[PDB]
Amino acid sequence: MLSFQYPDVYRDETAIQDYHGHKVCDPYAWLEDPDSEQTKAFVEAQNKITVPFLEQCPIRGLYKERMTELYDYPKYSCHFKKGKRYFYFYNTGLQNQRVLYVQDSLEGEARVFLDPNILSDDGTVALRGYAFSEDGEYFAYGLSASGSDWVTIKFMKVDGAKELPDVLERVKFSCMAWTHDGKGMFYNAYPQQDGKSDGTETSTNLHQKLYYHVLGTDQSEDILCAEFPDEPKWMGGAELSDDGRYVLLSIREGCDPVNRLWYCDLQQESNGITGILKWVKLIDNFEGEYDYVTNEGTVFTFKTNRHSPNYRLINIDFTDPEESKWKVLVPEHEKDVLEWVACVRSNFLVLCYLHDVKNTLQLHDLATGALLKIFPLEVGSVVGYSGQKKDTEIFYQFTSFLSPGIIYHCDLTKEELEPRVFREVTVKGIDASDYQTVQIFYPSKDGTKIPMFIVHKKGIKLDGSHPAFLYGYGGFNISITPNYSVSRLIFVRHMGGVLAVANIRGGGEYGETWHKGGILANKQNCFDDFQCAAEYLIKEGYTSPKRLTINGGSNGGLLVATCANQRPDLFGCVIAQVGVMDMLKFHKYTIGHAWTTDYGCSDSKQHFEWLIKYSPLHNVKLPEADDIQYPSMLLLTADHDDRVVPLHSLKFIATLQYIVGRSRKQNNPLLIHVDTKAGHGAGKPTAKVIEEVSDMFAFIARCLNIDWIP
Ligand SMILES: *C(=N)[C@@H]1CCCN1C(=O)[C@@H]1C[C@H](N=[N+]=N)CN1C(=O)CCCc1ccccc1
């Protein structure tokens, strides 16, 4: 089957670093330079063997045609009102980018407001962040090119969709918040740096500042409002209170759900916004999260995890701010996670809970916190919502493994509330009643019960004969909840497969305790949990090791790469997307310094000793047993992935090919594909999305010799 040769790749045998007395060789360190002729030649040579392997069998074409047909359905966001008009996103089906529409009423004709498709031939310029002025008459929006986190902010006047001259550069990981006087907007920017800032560089991002842009002026006139020169990793994001009186600054350092919270009463500024604001440091530590919900005068409602790992709502009065005085508006639940909270129609709160990895949605009274109404949902997720304090209605969007989505609407001015379907689209070709979703709880190595969803055709025999696709992430307080994927349903219907999603530790599914269960010294729990999910699918007869594919992205790419090293005998195929592979060096590049809150950092002997045991780059080893080889592996990355710099996948694949690929017993391929004009994944155009899933499933099909089922 292996009709290609791995390219020759130079090994710098002098690249040796001492980590606390432990010598580490890094012979492909040179791949860390994305601009070198050597690195460019490496990427070209890798793509030269991967692309023909993916495209050789008719299966890829068959999958691509089916994906193109089935993904071609209308895709809507929730409506949201801004000022006197309503807005929503819509894709007729296969547009590269969804388009923002405007209408003057719910019954009125809609027209195009902003169409990102016309900004590039290939759909590689995408919206990334936006903010309307408080009155809805002005609009700021971020644009990212080629999938980079870097943003350029532009402005429009809403009436007539008039382009304005204002352009803001050096924007990344930025807030966007207009003052209610309509004068200007807060945003974040990084200082100038040597070399490129286009998403191909690896330069660390430090000293982010908070600026205020006055509309109608040049960016060079912008006011510096906050900076942290003694704390280069701090990031201060601004928002205005609902009444426009206060700027609230949420300062983060790293990725944990915690923030400092400072406020500025704008009425107390001596002469408007003219420099560093008179910040009052309400919460001046990183011990808890304080997420603004609403305020009534000086009484501020926050969602918090302060001594409340499943989250709760508290009221802090700025005039009586000591912690002993805070009021608990909605107490923490014993098990269910309060995921997010919004305030709507002055005095309602909408709370969204996660109950065993499924969403519920409730309306509560702002004054007492009392439950008023349950909004009924099917089993799945709430993935969009609109309804601000001054608005009198809500929209929310529901999705599940088997259903594309339903947008609901509820008019909250009505005495008796009555949520109604507002938009619903069905995908023809995927009959949902042919399948089922089950939730099981399996024990991990240490006895902890882990949730797992399994999606399969009704009535299958559990005889181990079915290909399976097992997905996980496990980190960063991210909950992996039910979502509609046409790409995975094609694997089910046309490849006879079983889908599985394991809610392993590190995630947010059981609150901060679940998250802490999969970080730092305990990161190995994630891998144990995921290997145990694979063992469950096998033991219960859903699949067998030779038919099992695992997949994850970013932190999930780390997950599957580590699992391939630790239990190569458990998996037939591994697809690692945009994965963190070098655990000793990740903190050196772009925003990787922020991930030390989940991983630790190799500058500490204690942390190094954790990291070295599981770092994918540092644990590639020929299996000892003669009858065991590595699974077939595909790494997917892209040359503007400035979130997880692609040198992670480059160094890993060079290592896999040299250590394992050279062995006579290894016949499963170990390949990388590096895309162009793409990044970590956000904003990827439809065309590239289709190519990517076609690559993934063609790889699975060829490696496992799976027949298409038309
Ligand atoms: C992929 N999972 C990468 C590598 C490991 C962590 N990664 C992230 O992208 C993390 C996790 C969250 N993403 N998701 N899902 C967010 N994130 C970031 O790096 C966000 C960077 C910007 C930032 C940094 C610190 C505080 C707030 C925002």
From Swiss-Prot:
The modification N-acetylmethionine is found at M1. GO terms for cellular component: cytoplasm. GO terms for biological process: proteolysis. Its main location: cytoplasm. InterPro entries: AB_hydrolase_fold, Pept_S9_AS, Pept_S9A_N, Peptidase_S9_cat, Peptidase_S9A, Prolyl_oligopep/macrocyclase. It is an enzyme of class 3 (hydrolase). Keywords: Acetylation, Cytoplasm, Hydrolase, Protease, Serine protease. SUPFAM superfamilies: alpha/beta-Hydrolases, Peptidase/esterase 'gauge' domain. The active site is at S554 (charge relay system), D641 (charge relay system), H680 (charge relay system). Ubiquitous. The keyword DNA damage does not apply. Cleaves peptide bonds on the C-terminal side of prolyl residues within peptides that are up to approximately 30 amino acids long. This is Prolyl endopeptidase. It comes from Sus scrofa. The gene is PREP.
